[PDB]
From a paper:
The B antigen that is present on red blood cells (RBCs) of type B only differs from the H antigen that defines type O by the terminal galactose unit connected by an α‐1,3‐glycosidic bond to the sub‐terminal galactose. Thus, removal of this additional galactose yields the H antigen of blood type O. For this, we characterized several previously unstudied α‐1,3‐galactosidases belonging to the GH110 family. Our findings revealed that the α‐1,3‐galactosidase from [name] ([name]) exhibits superior efficiency compared to previously described galactosidases. Analysis of the structures revealed that the core β‐helix of [name] is surrounded by two small β‐barrel domains (domains I and II) as it is typical for enzymes of the GH110 family.
The structure of [name] in complex with galactose was refined to 2.98 Å resolution, while a resolution of 2.75 Å was obtained for the structure of the non‐complexed apo‐form of [name]. The galactose is bound in the active site by an extended hydrogen bond network established with several amino acids. Additionally, a stacking geometry via CH‐π‐interaction between the galactose and the tryptophan W497 was found, which often occurs in CAZymes. Interestingly the position of this tryptophan residue shifts if no galactose is bound. Therefore, this specific tryptophan residue which is also highly conserved, seems to have a “gating function” for the substrate. Overall, the observed crystal structures share a similar fold and similar active site residues compared to other recently solved crystal structures of the GH110 family, i. e., the galactosidase from Pseudoalteromonas distincta U2 A (PdGH110B) and from Akkermansia muciniphila (AmGH110A). Thus, a similar inverting catalytic mechanism of the GH110 enzyme class can be assumed where the three aspartic acid residues function as the catalytic residues. Interestingly, at the same position of the recently discovered α‐galactosidase of Akkermansia muciniphila that was found in the human gut, also a tyrosine residue is present at the position where we inserted the substitution W260Y in [name] that led to increased activity, even though this residue is not directly located in the active site.
Residue numbers in the entry: 34 to 617
The structure:
Amino acid sequence: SEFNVKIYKLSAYGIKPNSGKNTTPLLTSLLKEIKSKTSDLDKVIIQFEKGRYDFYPEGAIKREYYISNHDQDNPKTVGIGIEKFNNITLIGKGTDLMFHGRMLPLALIESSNVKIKDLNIDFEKPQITQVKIISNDTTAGNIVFETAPWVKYKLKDSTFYNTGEGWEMQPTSGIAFENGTKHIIFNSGDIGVGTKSVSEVSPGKIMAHHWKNKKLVPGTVIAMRSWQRPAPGIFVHKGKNISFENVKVHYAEGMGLLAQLTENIYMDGFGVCLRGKNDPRYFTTQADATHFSGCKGEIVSKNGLYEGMMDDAINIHGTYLKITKKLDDHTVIANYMHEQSYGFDWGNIRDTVQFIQSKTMELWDAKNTIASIKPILRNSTDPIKEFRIEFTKALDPVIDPSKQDIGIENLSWTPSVVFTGNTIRNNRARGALFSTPKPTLVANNLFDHTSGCAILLCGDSNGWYETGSCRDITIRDNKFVNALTSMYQFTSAIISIYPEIPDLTNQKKYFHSGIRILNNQFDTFDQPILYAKSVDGLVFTGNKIQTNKEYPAFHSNKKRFLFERVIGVDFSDNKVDGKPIEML
Ligand SMILES: OC[C@H]1O[C@H](O)[C@H](O)[C@@H](O)[C@H]1O
């Protein structure tokens, strides 16, 4: 073409801000055309203006997607489908993409060199229900709660439903928040909610007749929810060189950003957050803010704001298949085991694999290489639950599924990580999960009142089936303020290194190695700073621990440092309230 970049200002093509019309069928039809014309090396930009674009289900594409760490409800109702479309940039100018009903806002499928920039994603009617405690009669167990202004509910058979366009969902749990600070209420975590046995006092004032909780003082704001997570805000599958710059996801029925089987991801200014100090909402995403399942290359996530999520800010991990059958010396059948991670590819020819003894979480040193890999399917349409993997090298007969439980990590689909200069706060569960053997830098982050623990290095081939023996990770120059006001799975200390190990007494081999924790600041009211299970090599140096009394100490673990099957400890130049603490 006669142009280096072909720029499509959307308003020039019949797609205007603040029209209040359904943008879905228009942008869909338009992209389809721009695609059919642009050859491959051709570069494209799609440009939104200031103001608001609404997207509804009607006229949306219906894609069958399998999404890591999410409910496998199909089809998905997809707002914007970037599919097999390269060198494309979606850009806005303080733009507000507003979605309605149950939708997957943005899907990036099998696309390279995609950039998303200066653009916000939100739903008008979040499936999460915000309410405010009006009166709590602790004796009778009567709570009156006020629905927030934007909430449309129905009562049917004394049951509280939350509604939006084409959906109706009864909340079963919640997260309580301090009024004002927007912290999560001390020792709350997941709590039951009084959505059964209800009746209407007056519009937007609901009486719960059998709700007993002394913690829900007048003023407390509660995010009532279910466990459903069918679609993330931005889904990315099989991307190469993907970019997000100044992109905020304010809410989605699932994770903010879920990227899988993607090589190289760059994020500057990514937020999953509120619209500022004046946002009436206390909550953001129904699940994790950002999530990276089975990625590779380099992941940069910097200068982000994550707040009020119903889960972690970042989670970086792979998937252990479980071997169900050994056909011969070279060939096994292996299966996806969790309900929320199946239906997508796991590896390719030439991938490096290693095997794990699930019961004691011990690696075999003998690595292998995939020679062949084919999903096993009765009908073509069926989803990928089960593979037949062939290795180049023969397997030592000790690797037989009828002898013990054996898992497979794909060491090729593992990304390197830079997670710097972010702010995480006021969110459910942990702050950040890292599970990658590749080099990882976690630096100059602020963990301001995470509900659970700040950082979690896990690994589990029994429950979650999420890989991550760590080998190389520096957690430096971070600030951790009053982490762990509430318990969740694995929250044993501000930094918890907690692999899921069924049989620890019999473990000979250390699961994690090469962990350096240098020059951090821990502002805490409690005791537990570091918990470490099954580590060979653990540096803890130059760290400052400052005590405060913003809350009562309470954690069962009353030890600053708690090690279990840990060798290789280097511990120097640490302080507590400006006084040294040495091992010797
Ligand atoms: O501990 C693993 C767990 O971490 C978070 O809670 C995610 O929401 C889950 O999908 C899973 O990744």
